[PDB]
A paper describes a structure:
Here, we describe the biochemical and structural characterization of a seventh deubiquitinase family, which is distantly related to proteases for ubiquitin-like modifiers, but has a different active site architecture and is truly specific for the cleavage of ubiquitin. We provide a detailed analysis of ZUFSP (Zn-finger and UFSP domain protein), the singular human member of this family, which contains multiple UBDs responsible for the specific action on K63-linked chains. The active site Cys and Asp residues of UFSP and ATG4 are conserved in members of the ZUFSP family, while the catalytic His is absent. Human ZUFSP contains four predicted C2H2 zinc fingers related to the ubiquitin-binding UBZ-class, followed by a predicted MIU (motif interacting with ubiquitin) region.
For getting further insights into the unusual active site geometry of ZUFSP and the basis for its K63 specificity, we solved the crystal structure of a covalent complex between human ZUFSP (residues 232–578) and Ub-PA to a resolution of 1.7 Å. The reaction product of thiol DUBs with Ub-PA resembles an intermediate stage of the protease reaction, in which the distal ubiquitin (poised for removal) occupies the S1 site of the enzyme. The ZUFSP structure forms a globular α/β-folded core with two prominent helical protrusions. A long 29-residue helix (α1) points away from the active site and provides the S1 binding surface for the outgoing distal ubiquitin—here occupied by the covalently coupled Ub-PA. The α2 and α3 helices form a hairpin-like structure protruding from the catalytic core in the opposite direction. This region has little contact with the remainder of the structure and might form the S1’ site for binding the proximal (substrate) ubiquitin. As expected from sequence analysis, the positions of the catalytic Cys-360 (start of α5) and Asp-512 (behind β5) are analogous to UFSPs and ATG49,11. However, the catalytic His-491 of ZUFSP is provided by the start of β4, whereas the catalytic histidine of UFSP and ATG4 proteases would have been expected between β5 and α10. The interface most critical for proteolytic activity is formed by salt bridges involving two acidic residues of ZUFSP (Asp-406 and Glu-428) and the two arginine residues within the C-terminal tail of ubiquitin (Arg-72 and Arg-74). A second interaction surface is formed by the second half of the ZUFSP α1 helix, which binds the Ile-44 patch of the S1ubiquitin in an orientation similar, but not identical to that of the Rabex-5 MIU domain.
Numbering used by the authors:
A (entry chain A): 240 to 468, 473 to 578
B (entry chain B): 1 to 75
The structure:
């Protein structure tokens, strides 16, 4: 009799497991249900079906999209330039509560398109970081004037790193395939991607909070030490910092030392639409517009953050040493 | 009792556990089988992320239940 009862129980556990598995696979982009190309087209088709887009332009945006995918180049439609320069002007000229502020070099903001909205953050943060390297002469040899790659090309380039031998454990976690998927990525993928391009970088794993009320003072202090080294506003040469938490990533482009001695990060978000970033390019920024960029310790209460920071270029020998090191993938842990 | 732990690629292992085992203990049992450090593990059941100090009994885990194992920090 209990055999039947056991069957009923297992049959319900199975329906529950199957349902949650499919949900999680979809969320993380691992259910192998297509990729950027399909989502762009499906989401443009919705705009046509909602009478918000003529079929002719659809044919045109689809044509553009296909050229970009063929070339592997991001088409720049989600790019906003000039933010570092605008911030420089603001901190220099405007009355602020800042004692000193350190900024990364020039950084282009990239937000998701209809093709990667919901899952592209890691890739878009890579684009923002790469845009800084591409204007930094120290990376000219290892990046030889490459262009910002499109998301499918970034996926191909991560696969290329896996094929070279980088991080086989991480590769297996993502079915050894990213093209044609909407897979979430993390600092580990960005690390092997940059390392495969002979860019010297490293991950720091802030694996638990270090301050009261769940704050991460060690993270803020690490970033302060990264950016700092006389003027009130210091526009440094340094690339921005890739910042990962569970479910989403962002790009840290600077840090303020407030007059009250507290620290405040300046963070770009690939979820921010163009029209919001454009507000920062208006003559005389509105201090209320800067609040979205400013994150104090109270705003960073995820349990775990990983940063990926870039430090220069690698010789081939150094790259190969790092490839081998990536077989047992570890990162500096703090605390 | 026996439970299953399934990654999002479908890799499945079986664990021997008791209802009083903490999620922390379960992550250790996963490390024992797969070599994955607990810090790299996030366990999901019934749509909720399981917390280290809670026990399997806190979540109504039962024989042949399946926990889903998310690995590393992605987004």
């Amino acid at each position: 009799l209990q055999q039947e009862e056991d069957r009923k129980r297992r049959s319900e556990e199975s329906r529950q497991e199957i349902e949650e598995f499919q949900k999680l696979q979809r969320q993380y982009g691992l259910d192998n249900s297509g990729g950027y190309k399909q989502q762009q087209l499906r989401n443009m088709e919705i705009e046509v079906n909602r009478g918000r887009m003529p079929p002719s332009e659809f044919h045109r945006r689809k044509a553009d999209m296909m050229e970009s995918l063929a070339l592997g180049f991001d088409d720049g439609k989600t790019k906003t330039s000039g933010i570092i320069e605008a911030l420089h002007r603001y901190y220099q000229n405007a009355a602020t509560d800042v004692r000193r502020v350190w900024l990364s070099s020039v950084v282009d903001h990239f937000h998701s398109s209809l093709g990667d909205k919901g899952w592209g953050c890691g890739y878009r943060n890579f684009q923002m970081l790469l845009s800084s390297l591409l204007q930094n002469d120290a990376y000219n040899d290892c990046l030889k004037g490459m262009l910002i790659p499109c998301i499918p090309k970034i996926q191909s380039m991560i696969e290329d790193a896996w094929k070279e031998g980088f991080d086989p454990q991480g590769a297996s976690q993502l079915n050894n395939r990213l093209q044609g998927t909407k897979a979430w990525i993390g600092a580990c993928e960005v690390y092997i991607l940059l390392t495969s391009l002979r860019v010297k970088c490293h991950i720091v794993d802030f694996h638990k909070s270090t301050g009261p009320l769940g704050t991460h003072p060690r993270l803020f202090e690490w970033i302060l030490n990264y950016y700092s080294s006389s003027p009130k506003v210091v526009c440094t040469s340094k690339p921005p910092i890739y910042l990962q938490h569970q479910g989403h990533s962002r790009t840290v482009i600077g840090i303020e030392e407030k007059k009250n001695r507290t620290l405040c990060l300046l963070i770009l978000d690939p979820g921010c639409p163009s029209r919001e970033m454009q507000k920062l390019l208006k003559q005389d920024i509105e201090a209320s517009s800067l609040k979205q960029l400013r994150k104090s310790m109270g705003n960073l209460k995820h349990k775990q953050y990983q940063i990926l920071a870039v430090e220069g270029a690698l010789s081939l020998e150094e790259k190969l040493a790092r490839r081998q090191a990536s077989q047992v993938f570890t990162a500096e842990k703090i605390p | 009792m026996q439970i299953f732990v399934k990654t999002l690629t479908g890799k499945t292992i079986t664990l021997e556990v008791e209802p009083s085992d903490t999620i922390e203990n379960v992550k250790a049992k996963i490390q024992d089988k797969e070599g994955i450090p607990p810090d790299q593990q996030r366990l999901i059941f019934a749509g909720k992320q399981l917390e280290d100090g809670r026990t399997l009994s806190d979540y109504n885990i039962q024989k042949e239940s399946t926990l889903h194992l998310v690995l590393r920090l992605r987004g």
